[PDB]
Structure 1
Amino acid sequence: DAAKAYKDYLASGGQPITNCVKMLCTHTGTGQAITVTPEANMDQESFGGASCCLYCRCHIDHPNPKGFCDLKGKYVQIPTTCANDPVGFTLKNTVCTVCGMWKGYGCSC
């Protein structure tokens, strides 16, 4: 399990994955977690989807049946406070199915 492996490597004090591609945008977007365009708000940062996926970065198979990555080809918004480890944040958090925001970060449902 790579997901559990990375969570443990962070807890051991290891440096988070770097070289996550941060985009330039107006920071006036909807704030939703995953979008086809950078939708970061003033409190968020927008990153390339492929660069923030552990399974894409490590050149391994994805945790799905059809080899579909929901990040690749799209943009993931990360809270600026958690911007030093975009890969970890996506691994540790879920997206509200109805409002499109992160559960616990911008979800009012």
Structure 2
Amino acid sequence: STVLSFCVDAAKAYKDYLASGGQPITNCVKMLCTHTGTGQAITVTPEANMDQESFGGASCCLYCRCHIDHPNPKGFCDLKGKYVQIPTTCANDPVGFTLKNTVCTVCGMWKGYGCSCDQ
């Protein structure tokens, strides 16, 4: 409880690092792909559309890249072993994008970057 109560919050700490002009985490692995994919956020294979870039999941995960526990009772990673689609306009900071945005449980598209379930 005292270790859990104390624990880190690496998520907000990254936005603060970027806010203070910190260089975004590099070496996210960009894949070669057709760019005619479904455009869904996190997929078993690259699914980038004409407006996205596909990256190896583990390399875009703050917790994987910083070697720190994942925020989940099971410590399950949502990116590792998968491919994350990042809008070309945000492709310079894939770690920042996956942290700041959430996936739509219904259509699998990024909320605010592909999900149109709300009209």
Task: Give the TM-score of the pair, scaled to structure 2.
Answer: 0.91
Distance 2:112 2:43 in 1: 18
Secondary structure of the structure 2 residue equivalent to 1:46: strand
1:40 CA drift (Å): 0.1
1:67 CA drift (Å): 1.5
Distance 2:101 2:12 in 1: 13
Any unmatched runs of 5+ in structure 2? Answer: 1-8
User: What per-residue deviation string (whole Å, max 9, x for no partner) do you get for residues 4-25 of structure 1?
Assistant: 1001000001100000000000
- Paired residues, what number? 109
Distance 1:86 1:70 in 2: 14
Q: Which has the larger radius of gyration?
A: 2
User: What per-residue deviation string (whole Å, max 9, x for no partner) do you get for residues 79-109 of structure 1?
Assistant: 0000000000000001111011000101111
1:74 CA drift (Å): 0.2
1:65 CA drift (Å): 0.8
User: What per-residue deviation string (whole Å, max 9, x for no partner) do you get for residues 22-48 of structure 1?
Assistant: 000000100000000000001000000
1:68 CA drift (Å): 0.7
Task: Give the TM-score of the pair, scaled to structure 1.
Answer: 0.99
**CA RMSD in angstroms, aligned pairs only:** 0.4
Any unmatched runs of 5+ in structure 1? Answer: none
Superposed, 1:27-106 pairs within 5 Å as: 27-106=35-114
Q: Which runs of 4+ in 1 moved over 2 A?
A: none
